[PDB]
């Protein structure tokens, strides 16, 4: 639903690189491989965590809140 905080295999913190990953892809016109290496994810266990992630939270946010303050 949202980017996992840590890598499952080794526990490296990858939850703080989602926005950076998206910025590299969009603004810098970098391919997925270069963006991951730029972010410092060398082990393919970390690469798949960010490469294969699906951001479903954005889809949920389209719905109006059930309770509004």
């Amino acid at each position: 639903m949202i980017v996992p905080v840590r890598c499952f295999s080794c526990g490296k913190v990858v939850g703080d690189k989602w926005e950076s990953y998206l910025n590299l892809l969009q603004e810098d016109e970098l391919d997925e491989g270069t963006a991951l290496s730029r972010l410092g994810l060398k082990r393919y266990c970390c690469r798949r965590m960010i490469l294969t992630h699906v951001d479903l939270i954005e889809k949920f946010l389209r719905y109006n809140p059930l309770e509004k303050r």
Partner: peptide, 19 residues
């Protein structure tokens, strides 16, 4: 001997560019 990847996320731009 081939390309075992479904090249995406920049072929859409590639086609949109040459057009």
């Amino acid at each position: 001997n081939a390309s075992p990847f479904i090249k995406r996320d920049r072929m859409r731009r590639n086609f949109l560019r040459m057009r």
